[PDB]
């Protein structure tokens, strides 16, 4: 319909990737980009699984992998136990129903895997365009092992 | 009605994103990229709501959020009280008939939320292409707290 | 399909308008009347915005305007700062998922604009037909600056 | 099967709404306006559920809510314990084969929720047109706590 | 395509009519109701065709007529177009503020160029067309205002 | 649409005013989709709606006077003499509205009316018919009220 | 599409029925089996009513009926007052949005009918396949008057 | 590619359900019944995710939930820390090319969540038909805490 | 013609934008990108329609705006007074006729608005691909206040 | 059919290119991008056609070329296929682990059979293709690794 | 697709390296949908893209030297004598890449180049063109850089 | 036709006044049979008349200043600094008239004319443009007069 969606999505993806590469710490990607509302609802906690849950699991794995990497052939592989880790979360406010679904999924994943709620840091940004700039500060904070970005974009 | 509409839009979007990431301050992107003048008018101060109002609201929220951030789980969320903040508006001069509407909407939003007109700053660029080059110089000032870029793009 | 929807919607609209006109205080209208479920979901906090958020903003503006009106040419215009105001909320229970979405949006709007949660008064009525009669009491209460009605009707 | 189905339905709906607004007591509108006898039967004590049961439940909830109202944020919500309340049923006599079903459903709902049959009051009007004229006189009694209007309309 | 348009339009029309009949003073209905943005913009942009001018002119004539009526051939009552010394109150919807400002400027221009001073015009803004009736009723209850004009835009 | 809103609102206003003030208010609003049929209906001598409006107003006024003053039967007369009327005519489409006003006044005079008692008011728009007719109906000297107008789609 | 849905649904239904018959206590069935997402959303608290609410009401009625049965012609019929009863709830985690909708509906029904929240026992199982095995323990617990199973299955 | 695909699938599903109900311990059913080899491959370690990983996760959650259960309102929810549990895997040997993938996925899930390989137990049955007969004997051991059945079915 | 039209166009546009943002010096981009030759001829034939004049006036306005920026509300604008300014033109050699037309238009615009030919520095680059690399050096030359890039690209 | 595929693929490609240009050491792109699972499986299963072998071979040649370049006719620089004494770091996506393991085994077999010892290979696993760039950048910043290979699968 | 990703990435790398290192880097990547049109374009004596690449590199190097050393006009010469070049050629489709390299070297020699100064590098894949050309461009002895390759859909 | 009569009369009046008063009277009037082509000529900011008309007025004012105050070549610059203008507008066709007036004023201000030196006068019909323009030109402070109007053929 409009190139607004294309520009927003490409820009946020490029910003998140550049931020992750420059700051050298994992930033997970939970921006559900959908053409219609049906598939967005499907991926927002419905039959196709919670993308927030998947992103939280990926963040846990990446944090453990980086811990093991900094601390025959040697194989580097991170566990899924999230005990003793601190995660940062950035969530868009647009489409707040699906956003809250994803946030609940991610928090549930972290808590069930072992992360205490005292370690989760949540930041709400008005739109998905503002995710990279806030994620920059959340990642530059040294007490954040991994950052997660969460948002919804629908054509 | 620019022929290289996609090129100009991509360049200005990437420029604004890179400037925001480098300068670590909110640069809201309220730009109306419409494929037809019908939807351009429908988004410029009409049924779908003017982009200027939404951009100003997002800028206020991001400014408050950044102030709080630089100042169970910890939740950082920005208010909507623009009393005591400084904003810098950049406006393209190509399509005056709609840019004036967007600028009026943004200024009205700021004033109603509580921002004095003595604090905002307006910079008129001739074309939508040279939005980020001026936006960077505007944001580099330590007095301006948030930046709002405004332009119209038609193919 | 059936004239039940037509009768319910027309009756509730007429009742709300007559109540507002007779009691001389703002009553905002958040009755999402939709032909299908898709557009109802769209307007219930999805891409088309939160009608509860819009109604809360309208109620804040009307309350401020009435305060200024009771307390070249003179122009009367209300601000959007909701500090020191008390709002009444009436919410239908039918379609409680979308209703809770709208209620969360409205409460979030009021709290972010400045209204303390100690001033919001919530009343749940079983159906949208019962909104006018309860809104009558909520508006006849003298401590309520503005009333909001919230409901969902789907053909 | 009345020819002026739309006229009668609109008049009775507006009458019930105006009576409820003027008398400030709940008058539940459980009336089955169906375009065809098939859906009329489908709604009268069948797969879609009888209107009488829903109307009685709504009346009980509204009566409890009004009792509580006249007696963080404050939330007023009505229970479903009809023990100790007084209800007045108005029933059209046009289509007995379905009105009897609706009345039986409503009385059963009240009795099961805990309302003694000594407290309810039933008034049989000949046609659906003269529902509000009797409903007003019934509601004006200070003993009756809630009113339930019941009728069948077919085109 | 939603019944929201129909309900809002019918309700605001009924509210304005009831207010006019109750308070016995002229309230003029400058509310465009259009199915297409094209025709809405056409009506708003047409200088004389814009409802802001016509509603203001009708309000002036009705105010003069009421003044004359309160003040052997068949008595014929009619009002002039001289707005010298009258008082008008405009209530403008804020939705679709481009066309709204067009109509409001048209109405103010009509009043001023027909004679009314600027200090005799009171302008109130309501966030939506739904909130027009209550503000219009407040302005009409204000006994100083001689006539009321309600300006709004509704588009399907 | 806009036509529907205006027509419904003016009809509601007239009916509500008649019911509230308890005096005859007569309807002379020609609602036409095309100008041709309205011209056709107005061109007839007796076919003008103003004549029917005046006749109905006279009959209703006489019936009201009789009611206020086998089975009982009440019915109004056509003795227009000794009655007071208030006509409210729209200015839009004055070409045909003049025909209708001529018909109404002619009917009243031929049944015994006095131009001294007949009172005429002109309204810029059909939307202002109820509010203007309200003053005439509230004036206790006026016995019957007639509204005249044309609405075209 | 696949027989996976058929097998899961038939197996869970058979397991629940066999468990109820063997343990001789009511187990209510809130497994929304839908071919598409539209009707599932409709039945998950939307226009077609809350199946969780219906299941909670059925469980209350069955518990009261069993109490009366254990404690002209004699007619056995249970009331709807849920005062002094303890209910067990089993909820699937798949499709957690609709599941939370159903759970909120059921808890709201119980609380409004009179059951205190100190008597509700909630158990979350990862999938709908695991509902029978957990319901077995929840029903073998002697302090549970009635058990409710809640889940969503979509083709 | 078995001809009596429906018969074998129904029999094994009913067998697993009955065994779980009788033995009162979790027997997760991760079996890939696909009508075509294309979707079989799409579900066996591909875009849709391997069934083994999901089955192992469900088994871990059910084991933790049962441990907690046998050990406002009370909410019982299982964690995802497989450290200190015992699992018994049953695997059909019909389609090795996919069963090996599923078994590798399940073992990887358990190991990453924290389960030592010294605790899991693997039993290879020749065909998918004789899954429950071995599953019962495996679950009857008091050392095995959870059971996971794995097989491929194609028509 | 151009072998890789999209690649060349995107490359030159992104290079110009990045150079402008990095050097904080206005670079105007007037390049005729057309599928056909006749479209380019149309875009270049007109006096003001040709990109030369528009690019010249845009560079003049940007230079004046920057002169204002370096040293009710505050508004920054730039007049169309080219007196006292030095510009740097970079023209592609390909499509010599169109490029010469555009360069003549730009030079005529500068002279007419009040620029002396002694301050204009012209550079010729053999290909459009080499426009940004030369523009970088021309802009790094502090003698120049604004850079202009002129070229024709045809599919 | 979603733009998620396009965004992920373009972003990982840009990240790998930027890392290679910044750190001046060869990073090879063994990431299959396919619209159909059929062609994805075909490319993964083809022994020589599998990207694991080709990426490893290209990495070996590039490592030798860089070694030679850092160490009257026109100077021609070229690398042999002898991986004796080099160091390689593989970063494998875990999504679609069947084809992923196929490609990883192919790459390891290529390196070992061309000469590299097993102790000189470092294998890192990332949960998704999106996380490949950061791990690849960490491995490249590790100065011990001579060349980097990024193995992944993306299917529409 | 894969072709689009590779082509876009190599173009981005070349342009970014040229802008960062402030020295001419020339493009000789033939992007063709079919092999036939690429063969047609490569078969011509002057039509080979290597000749155009070498000519543009020489002109840009001379222009850069002049810039570093009515209105002012800067423009490069074709005096290839006294210049240093670094060619990076892909190995894939060596049949046509050899034609292109021959054309480039022939142009440089005929305009005054020295094979002693000309430096050639072979890359196994087109994906490795930017990273390999980075070293040649960073070598300050090299004045111009040329990349040569073929991409076919 | 009447449209032709009006157009010829306004053109003749403007030419006569310009010649008799010796100051530039720029003529921005869009005369068209149909509103579609009227809007076609009104849009396209360069093709929009107002900007070009103001530009020509500035050029003529500068040329006249140079004239009053090898071979000798006289030519006007595009610097509106220190110049006073008088704009006459036609109220009819307000939609396009607003755009044209905005364009003319924007051109003057951007080139350097201060808003304290622009005098705008509106006339109800295009027939009244000549006499108002004559009054503005007879005013001594005004240097150039720009007459802006739309004409539709019937």
Coordinates of N, CA, C and O in Angstrom, one line a residue, chain A residues 48 53 57 61 77-81 108 112-113, chain H residues 53 57 61 77-81 108 112-114:
Chain A
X48 N 1.3 -20.2 15.8 CA 2.7 -20.2 15.3 C 3.7 -19.8 16.4 O 4.8 -19.5 16.0
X53 N 8.8 -15.2 23.0 CA 9.4 -16.4 23.7 C 10.6 -16.8 22.9 O 11.6 -17.1 23.6
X57 N 14.5 -16.8 24.4 CA 15.3 -18.0 24.4 C 16.6 -17.7 23.6 O 17.7 -18.1 24.1
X61 N 20.5 -17.8 25.2 CA 21.5 -18.6 24.6 C 22.7 -17.8 24.2 O 23.9 -18.2 24.4
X77 N 29.4 -23.5 22.7 CA 27.9 -23.7 22.6 C 27.4 -23.2 24.0 O 27.9 -23.7 25.0
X78 N 26.3 -22.4 24.0 CA 25.8 -21.9 25.2 C 24.6 -22.7 25.7 O 23.8 -23.2 24.9
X79 N 24.5 -22.8 27.0 CA 23.4 -23.5 27.7 C 22.2 -22.6 27.6 O 22.2 -21.4 27.2
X80 N 21.0 -23.1 28.1 CA 19.8 -22.4 28.2 C 19.4 -22.0 29.6 O 18.4 -21.3 29.7
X81 N 20.2 -22.3 30.6 CA 19.9 -21.9 31.9 C 20.2 -20.4 32.1 O 21.4 -20.0 31.9
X108 N 7.8 -14.5 30.7 CA 7.5 -15.8 31.2 C 8.6 -16.8 30.9 O 9.0 -17.6 31.7
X112 N 10.7 -18.6 33.8 CA 10.7 -20.1 33.9 C 12.1 -20.7 33.7 O 12.4 -21.7 34.3
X113 N 12.9 -20.1 32.8 CA 14.3 -20.6 32.6 C 15.1 -20.3 33.8 O 16.1 -21.0 34.1
Chain H
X53 N 12.3 -31.6 20.0 CA 12.6 -30.5 20.9 C 11.4 -30.1 21.7 O 11.5 -30.0 23.0
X57 N 10.8 -30.5 25.8 CA 10.4 -29.4 26.6 C 9.1 -29.6 27.4 O 9.0 -29.3 28.6
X61 N 8.7 -29.8 31.5 CA 7.7 -29.0 32.2 C 6.7 -29.9 33.0 O 6.4 -29.6 34.2
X77 N 2.8 -24.2 38.5 CA 3.4 -24.0 37.2 C 4.8 -24.7 37.1 O 5.5 -24.5 38.1
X78 N 5.1 -25.4 36.1 CA 6.4 -26.1 36.0 C 7.4 -25.2 35.4 O 7.2 -24.4 34.4
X79 N 8.7 -25.4 35.9 CA 9.8 -24.7 35.4 C 10.4 -25.4 34.2 O 9.8 -26.3 33.6
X80 N 11.5 -24.9 33.7 CA 12.2 -25.5 32.6 C 13.7 -25.8 32.9 O 14.6 -25.6 32.1
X81 N 13.9 -26.3 34.1 CA 15.3 -26.6 34.6 C 15.3 -28.2 34.7 O 14.8 -28.7 35.7
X108 N 19.5 -33.0 22.6 CA 20.1 -31.7 22.7 C 19.3 -30.8 23.6 O 19.9 -30.1 24.4
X112 N 21.0 -29.3 27.0 CA 21.2 -27.8 27.1 C 20.4 -27.3 28.3 O 20.9 -26.4 29.0
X113 N 19.2 -27.8 28.6 CA 18.4 -27.4 29.8 C 19.1 -27.9 31.0 O 18.8 -27.3 32.1
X114 N 19.9 -28.9 31.0 CA 20.8 -29.3 32.1 C 20.7 -30.7 32.5 O 21.2 -31.1 33.6

